[model samples]
Target: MEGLAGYVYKAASEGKVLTLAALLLNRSESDIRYLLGYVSQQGGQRSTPLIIAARNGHAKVVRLLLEHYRVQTQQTGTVRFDGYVIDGATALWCAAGAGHFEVVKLLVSHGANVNHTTVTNSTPLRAACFDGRLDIVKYLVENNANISIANKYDNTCLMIAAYKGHTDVVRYLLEQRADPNAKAHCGATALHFAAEAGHIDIVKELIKWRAAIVVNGHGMTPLKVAAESCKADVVELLLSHADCDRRSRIEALELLGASFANDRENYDIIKTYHYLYLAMLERFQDGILEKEVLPPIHAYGNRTECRNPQELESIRQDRDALHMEGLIVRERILGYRGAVYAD
Candidate 1:
């Protein structure tokens, strides 16, 4: 980290093209060639000047480095820091991760690997989507970047965008035929991520695009995940879907109801009960749950700021009664746990 190599790394990090130019001008062609491949330790991470330039969106500096080095366009390397070395990231991955549209284009033009992945199998396309770079994302797709590529976690670009609440990017990816039903390692779909994050718009779009509402993994559907995560709007939205997370929602409501009933002082339990009651009612109306006389609707009010403590206590009692009724109805629908519960 001393002379020209250090200067180049610093210059690249700061996007100082002229300073880099001055340093390159003072060195011989042979020295410049050696400096181009120079690896420097910055912030406890090892990176080449090219990676720093690409990561920081210094396109001019990137071009200057590429034109002088005759380096491999698809060169593979990793940035190591904090006792963890991130492997399999190419210059293209760096540019994409930073939403550097110009740098991404230049690298692609120079034959950079668009589908190159890191140790986590993170591709440039996934990086762009994860960062919500819609323009860069479209450019990568136009360049034939694979939209279906999943990371080591099995999270596709759509799942990442949906979870991060990038509605525009999620829409674009969906338009590009990204699989909405694609499941992560945990068997959660993009809809599940959207539901968990309470992205109402993304959830609607995914459901419109025929995203699966049923669950075959973790015994939790998107509806159940939304409910458990306390995403009220998402829970309500999923309840309207033809195939909701009936079993899991019932079980979660029962478990939460029992836990909350034991602690009358917990407002969270009352709030949970209200949503579970509404969810159960929705199912009953849809003919998924056994038909029964429904109770009067009770407002759970805002969970954040409750003004009436006495009112909340009343709601808690109602929740206990509703929980008992809902459980009995569910038992009548599918009766035995041995039929559905495998674990």
Candidate 2:
């Protein structure tokens, strides 16, 4: 028994595909299976040959082990390694984390629990997303892995991907109808994570999907989180959207400060302030943004005017520039009571 187990372990470790085949051929399938399950003398981790093979991503050995042993797809146990029992993970977790796409597919086809969670509540989908394994993420989702399943921390696969800045995974999850606003146990959504991590494009994507920027019980709006984390670009991007909270809106106004025109030479900087200016006007109509805190100067080309400007030439020049900018049209302009014309 020790000799056969040693041979199996040796062949599996060396990835000697043919040697493993020959060893399996001579013995009864059950006999080989029992030997393979025994802890081998060569490996110090008290790991079975199958566990070692799967951990090392030896796909052929894993397939062979699956063939010889009627390994239950839903088998639940820990593979003891380095004298510690790492609990609640299957071979699929190993393969997915290792980025072995083909092995993952094989294990899933064999009925492995695609949604199985580790002892710490880490799922294969969660692991795949954390590592930016897009192929494995797609395979698991396609194989019925639940993207909405949260870990012990209440983080879904989508949130994990967003946190790790895996934009491709985030996009795919959103496309697959994964909830962009799914909150973790910490009351943080994917948008919060993206903003905090300074993922400006992801912040825009989440906002486009109408993900709530200020989810309840999180205590931090996405804009505030970005600000507190010092993600300036993320802060700017969130504020540019009209949907963010009044506090975020006002906070951004303060951040951009009275010197918004100081950086007016930069188109993006000016465009961001332009969006905020539009939001401010919208808020003023609702009695939310006070006139006192409004920026003193709004720049348009060579002209920088207060919130209330009196000069006709300044207004006309601003009109053409604003028209070209496309941020606000005459129809969208509030505070005008009568028929308005685009000069």
Candidate 3:
């Protein structure tokens, strides 16, 4: 094949627009822009001189390639660039993902399709958002890039931004009216990702944008996720949300208490007691929102492990009893883990 395309690749990467122009004088369009990097059919992709320039953020080189690409006119003479796939990523995808704002802007202005995607259907905006490319994401959105675009797994730009903890980007996306309640293939929203990842700021933003508290493919709400992951602060924040109902709060408190009590690595019995105390308050808060206490079942067997408001009175009267109550609650939920079973 034509390995001689390397010269054009070199010049483009180095931003030698003059060298590229001279090379264009003697070579055909396909000769200068053809794939020079792929061996056979490995990744099912290849590279081009223009793509190299964009990938390297050589804005001037990209300008020259697109400019000289047309022997006719810049308007009518656009190169077919789909074949130059770095993992099915186009030049704009590479440029946007690499955080090259100038190259990304140049490519889009010169007719680069910003919505172009990867082999698995990951768009340039998604890639930029995934990598927390704040400026690139902002530029792409301004140029009509689809903010609600989903990858193959139905993950939106907003979702990934929350998952990666880019609080600033998440705020901007919400302000731009990115669907706060947007879902993945499994029904997880942007709030779920942020909550589970301990991104309290992003979760608060999503809540401001009215993200719903819903279950995902994992069969759990964001509240459950926070509690399971020991995100005590997130659990409290979510519980305090106006949208979070009483049932959800109680369930999360119970889970948090049980989870913290059973896991030895998280030996914060005080924290467990705090959530248990919240649960007790939630039960007595109001008949409109409370779950009624049913008949008692035996402890550590049919049921029962010291979850009583009166029982805590004595525990409050004595710190050792409080510790013992916390231990009883732990044993009731998770049975016996050798380490936690010591008590």
By lDDT, the best candidate is 1
Task: Give the clashing pairs for model 1.
Answer: none
| Candidate 3 local distance difference test against the native | 0.67
Backbone clash count, each prediction separately: 0, 0, 1
Q: State the weakest 10-residue window (summed lDDT) of model 3.
A: 334-343
- Evaluate all candidate structures by whole-model CA lDDT and list the values in order: 0.68, 0.63, 0.67
Model 2: which residue pairs collide? none
Residue 127 miss distance in model 1 (angstroms): 0.9
Residue 12: error of model 1 in Å? Answer: 2.4
Q: Mind giving the per-residue lDDT tens digits that candidate 1 earns over 1-343? A: 2487888778877889888888877676678767767777675566778887887889988888777656566655575422555576777887887788999998898888888877778888888887898999999999999998788877788888898888999999888888788877777788878887789999988988889875736666776666555566676677675752565555445434333333334335455556445544545555365434333334322222111233233455554454443344333322311111000
Writing each residue's lDDT as its tens digit, candidate 3 over 1-343 gives 4544566666766889887778666665575445333222224434556666677789888777666564111111112233433366677877777778888888888777877766556778887887687898888899888887777777788888888898889988888999888777777888777877789888889888888888877577888888777777898889887645666677688678756656676757677777777777766766544334333445433333444566544443344444445545544333301100000
The digit string of per-residue lDDT tens for model 2 on 1-343 reads 6778788878877778788888877677678657766665443344566656666778887787676566555544465543545565577876676677877877887778888888767788876887788888898989898888777667777777777788998898999899987776667888888887888777877887888765535466776666545466786787776754674565454333222322343334344445445445555566355434222224434332334322212433454443332222211221111101000
Q: How much is the lDDT of residue 184 in candidate 2?
A: 68
TM-score of each: 0.74, 0.68, 0.76
- Who is ahead in lDDT, 2 or 3? 3
